[PDB]
Symmetry: D2
Subunit: 351 residues, 4 copies
């Protein structure tokens, strides 16, 4: 038998998977078909994100990431995950063609099932690196309870196996130029920022004791506290513990090296990767936020079939507490004028 | 005990349908998984579009459309189809993150299967109203099918298309009755008069090569607007497949255009706009498919037999535009003052 | 003969790009993108004001009472939605600028900011955002003729108010007519008989008829519509298929759409500002990021009532049966 | 203090809206949408020219030789394709104007058209649309509709080095092409010759079947196309026919970057070639969405027949980059890299 489209794509499974509970309980509602197909498409795309994501995790875990041939493939697959999520954010607009009233006519046949029971959404959160600590109080206790057997087993492995956060952290820690014996990035930077701020305090104190200056002297003192707190490793470990940061002090230094020196040939694709990790975080959140806006129109204030407050619980998930790579965002707090960036000498350029 | 998300959605089926031919032949190629999911996603949405479309056909076929209570349901479902198609056009962006080089690594394992074997794509084309005899020469499309599937295509070819059902509904548009509002006779009279006057204002002007441009413009207009009232011409053009709608449906469509602000016509106007939307997005679908296949194959021939790129280009024409007549009513728009007063 | 460039006054549009970075002697390439992005946002804000004002004027001059105008109204409201969808997508362009590169010309913007966009505020005011519900005055940014326009835009009737009046005159609320409200209270009460969530579900439904609770929540600002407007809204939801209700229901749908898309614009702005500045202060004085997060809330959802009515949805067999008489009144 | 409105010069941008219907005493509401839409497009064409000129410059002044500039080049080419995506999306706004409403102000616009957009022509020229290959309108050149300085600026844009010419030059210096070096081309012919021979043996070994009759017709087709690629004389011929645009040597660089894209020196260059095809594809979707809208607005009123001509490979400047997918070969035929050339493609 020569290969046929329908058989290749196992459409005898995919297109024989649509059972309107409304029809099964004798009262067919038209739009329930849309409800099912929308979720099934979301779930196809989750599996494909998981396929890309597990493949990039494997390239870090098995050391292939160490060979820089593999960086185009890493960035290309991670960018693919953001392109898919973009589509998933847009996909909400299809289900927004269902009125709250028409939803109401079949809602009742759904209890107590809910999106909460999405295994693959949880595999996706975990594998990226959402920690138990990060999860909203209701979310934390209640998320893994919905599961049993092999489904319970996959969820554990997703919590226990190396997350994309951990693997990126290890890789960032080996960023070339951090070696105190070599380029000594962190040392040179602390020196240049200290030198840099001293020049700034002198520029400001040289002005005629006015109120435009008084604005500058106190804006300086805030900027100085902040820039110098970069070098306070104990503040890092303290912020690590309140989970306001997630990355090792040294990964942070790696990420900042990649940012400042991103044009150097060996950092070009590494910079692209860091941008794609922020994009995935931004789009995961835009997904959460587009989900909230739609549930508001569908339920108003009413409790969800899963037994949550509904619209309010979901609103609490749209928070930086769920941004895994929140640190890559927060590095923008520590941007300095280009003039203060430790200059590169011919030795480390060729490197 | 109680309904579980996974069970409701039959994810035991949906998420166990992903078999890489490259893996089955012991040379697993990563990007093959994307190829499969992308098509599985397209096919879920094709099934939803058929669901909405068949529901709208039945509302015309069983006379429920006669009861104007049901027009919000009709327009909202036809709008929903165009919203889904917007997503399917955007959806090519995902598959375009596969390089041609990466595609080249699993392409051999697909032979001789292809999109020509999409039952649902063909069912959708037929149910809207793509005729067997208007398909570009190389498409003979149904030979790619056998068995139960092949029967369904013929039910789809012989059962009443959206085009036929909208034609019948257009033929009953209120205002067309020669003893009533007599739209057609009044429109002919007002265009004939409006033109006569328009020509008087040209023979005022001082003979020049500017006045000759007006006379030349006027003669082109006159011929086009007056040809609207040539029924023998419409029947000739129907038979050549340059028009699809009966002469009387065309009159009903023009009535809906001119008088759209009249409450009874507001939603019917939204319906005609949606039908044109759906043709526009189908053709955007064919064009985005074409643009991607060019990057993937070049001028190489398809696994499904055809020349690939060049053949698919040919499917991006008004040959495949079911509601072409609704686009071409723009050709016969006239100044407001000429529209018969209500 | 008319020429494209002159029709479009391109001599102004394409001579409006001045890089402040270039003016102070070190041109930064990416500033040109920052300028053009803001200019296109402002062109589109103007087009939304033009649509919105024309719909305001169609309620205020009485024409909305002529139902042949409903197509124009829902079509112009729909158009504002399509423009807002593009304005949300348009952040994707400015996100091709890295924080690093932004950082190179940001110094020259001090102290200008979005807070000084007149059109954004006119738009917020004209839809019906109340200044007493804003997270902190915004007018302190504005002076001269701009402070005037802005003042007019709070005092002149908002889209919410005009939509309110219109919802208040909705066919079927008349107590000695179809008496929608009385029959609904009869019908919710007659159905509420049958781990039971029923006790919670009965408590919330029946508080719909508590005209007093509404009065309190309204003055407080957690609700925005008159009690009677909210009756009209719910009338149009339940009887949306009735010929006369179809395009009015499309209008309510598109009003919620505009709230969603404003909030989506607010949230996309936030996501981009987060990558651009981090937890830095904004050039206009505020703790940029955390303040912009506060604008993404129901304080700023003008038509929150139309959203919240999903709470009070009932099975259809409870909805007051519509007799052959009022079926006749709601035909064309 | 700098003020938002002054910074953006809004005193120009938001005082550039003159409805011609209104300045002839019959104001039509939708004419405003028409004007804003075009003005948004023109703002964005100006951004695309800003990006595209900086990139041409980077090539022209020899800075692109310094590979630390590749992140900037590929960022600005990707940005152009991101802008062009929104411009394609932008047509949906104008599609909310009905043909009936458009018809109320159409008369006031004569004889102006999109044909008169200076920036759209510069954009076409600077990317590298050849005037010799453009479909004529009314049997005449596209520069007829422009005079004075605008006519002069279009002429410069035809004569100055196009993005195509500057990519072509850089494609010609692709490392690995040196006959005395890695000798990519010679090695490729050798590996393709062997590949086809090895393939012809496994087929002639199969039983005389439907497959055997078929695979010999297909194999003989694939054979003609692949050996086609080494025919430098055919290529020079197709250059002049305009059916190909890049020099034979540039073609070689492009194919080298495809096959060895994972090589670090080749990662970002492959991303650039991917972006060039992206821009061609999005310019053509621009042309097609414009057409689909004009069909609805005008019908057969013949502009709509010229516009369907522009949706053609005449206007696809990097058509060669697409067509290379014709000459793709199994992974294992690609000439291997050794530690003398592998180490020359390490950053
Ligand atoms: C009318 C449509 C929808 C409604 C009313 C809705 C409602 C809800 C509600 C109320 C919750 C909170 C848990 C609960 O009370 O049950 C929830 C969570 C969730 N929904 Fe939806 N939903 C809708 C559509 C979708 C769609 C299309 C998806 C696609 C996969 C989805 C995926 C999820 C997921 C994964 C969660 C768990 C979120 C988390 O804990 O962070 N929902 N939904
Ligand atoms: C990504 C690489 C893809 C390639 C290389 C490709 C190639 C082709 C080719 C060559 C044909 C013409 C028949 C033949 O000679 O085989 C075709 C037709 C078709 N393809 Fe694709 N395709 C791709 C993706 C897709 C996707 C994602 C869909 C989604 C449904 C799709 C649906 C179809 C359909 C329905 C047809 C029949 C088109 C018609 O006759 O009008 N293809 N494709
Ligand atoms: C890199 C890009 C951008 C950054 C970093 C940025 C940053 C900020 C910040 C920090 C604020 C808070 C006020 C302040 O401190 O000045 C703000 C407010 C604002 N921005 Fe932006 N912005 C950006 C782009 C845009 C664009 C493209 C628009 C388009 C109109 C815009 C419109 C606004 C408006 C209207 C406000 C006031 C809005 C409100 O009060 O909710 N911004 N922006
Ligand atoms: C109602 C909307 C539109 C109509 C009816 C329309 C119609 C046309 C027509 C008929 C032509 C061919 C020249 C002629 O015969 O006058 C044309 C060309 C053109 N239009 Fe449009 N157009 C529309 C919107 C737009 C928009 C929004 C743009 C944005 C810049 C635009 C840009 C162009 C350009 C650049 C050309 C020349 C294209 C080429 O030569 O390949 N048009 N248009
Ligand atoms: O090739 C390498 C060097 C090292 C590495 C870790 N992080 C990095 C970040 C940027 C960079 F350029 C190199 C590295 C690694 O393990 N693989
Ligand atoms: O009001 C509701 C409905 C339910 C829900 C959302 N998405 C789903 C998908 C499948 C399913 F079975 C149920 C649901 C939920 O979470 N609250
Ligand atoms: O209600 C109706 C009347 C009639 C009809 C046919 N075409 C129409 C077009 C517009 C309109 F308002 C009504 C009609 C029909 O069969 N159903
Ligand atoms: O060159 C090709 C590849 C093939 C193809 C496209 N889409 C598919 C989907 C399923 C399948 F099995 C094969 C295909 C086709 O039609 N021409
Ligand atoms: O002719 C009319 C009817 C009335 C009206 C007010 N609100 C409504 C809401 C729905 C509806 F169908 C009609 C109305 C109005 O102001 N003029
Ligand atoms: O950090 C910043 C930069 C500034 C800003 C945003 N958009 C603008 C537009 C024009 C302008 F001049 C300045 C701005 C702001 O609000 N916070
Ligand atoms: O660094 C270099 C090498 C050379 C070059 C030309 N084309 C290329 C294409 C890819 C590549 F990696 C390098 C090159 C150049 O002009 N400067
Ligand atoms: O019916 C028309 C109008 C004109 C056109 C298209 N875009 C424009 C923009 C500005 C302008 F003034 C005129 C036009 C054209 O080509 N055919």
């Amino acid at each position: 038998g020569g290969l046929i489209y329908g058989n290749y794509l196992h459409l005898e499974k995919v297109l024989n998977a649509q059972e309107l509970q409304s029809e099964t309980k004798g009262n067919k509602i038209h739009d329930e078909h849309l409800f099912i197909i929308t979720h099934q498409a979301y779930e196809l795309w989750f599996k494909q994100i998981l396929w890309e994501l597990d493949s990039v995790r494997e390239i870090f875990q098995n050391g292939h990431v160490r060979d820089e041939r593999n960086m185009l493939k890493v960035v290309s697959r991670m960018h693919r995950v953001s392109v898919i999520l973009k589509l998933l954010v847009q996909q909400f607009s299809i289900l927004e063609t269902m009125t709250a009233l028409d939803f109401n006519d079949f809602r009742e046949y759904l209890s107590p099932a809910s999106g909460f029971q999405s295994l693959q959404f949880r595999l996706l959160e975990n594998k990226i690196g959402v920690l138990q600590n990060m999860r909203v109080p209701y979310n934390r206790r209640h998320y893994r309870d919905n599961f049993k057997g092999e489904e319970n087993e996959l969820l554990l492995k997703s919590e226990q196996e190396k997350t994309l956060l951990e693997l990126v952290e290890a890789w960032l820690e080996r960023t070339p130029g951090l070696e105190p014996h070599g380029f000594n990035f962190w040392g040179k930077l602390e020196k240049n920022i200290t030198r840099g701020l001293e020049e700034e305090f002198i520029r400001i104190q040289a002005k005629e004791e006015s109120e435009e200056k008084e604005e500058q002297v106190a804006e300086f003192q805030k900027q100085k506290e902040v820039l110098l707190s970069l070098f306070d490793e104990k503040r890092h470990e303290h912020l690590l513990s309140k989970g306001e940061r997630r990355l090792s002090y040294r990964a942070l230094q790696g990420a900042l090296m990649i940012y400042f020196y991103r044009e150097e040939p060996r950092f070009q694709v590494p910079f692209q990767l860091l941008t794609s990790l922020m994009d995935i975080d931004s789009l995961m959140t835009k997904w959460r936020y587009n989900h909230v806006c739609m549930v508001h129109r569908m339920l108003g204030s009413k409790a969800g079939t899963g037994g949550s407050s509904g619209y309010h619980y979901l609103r609490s998930t749209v928070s930086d507490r769920y941004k895994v790579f929140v640190d890559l965002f927060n590095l923008s707090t520590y941007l300095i004028p280009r003039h203060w960036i430790p200059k590169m000498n011919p030795t480390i350029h060729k490197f």
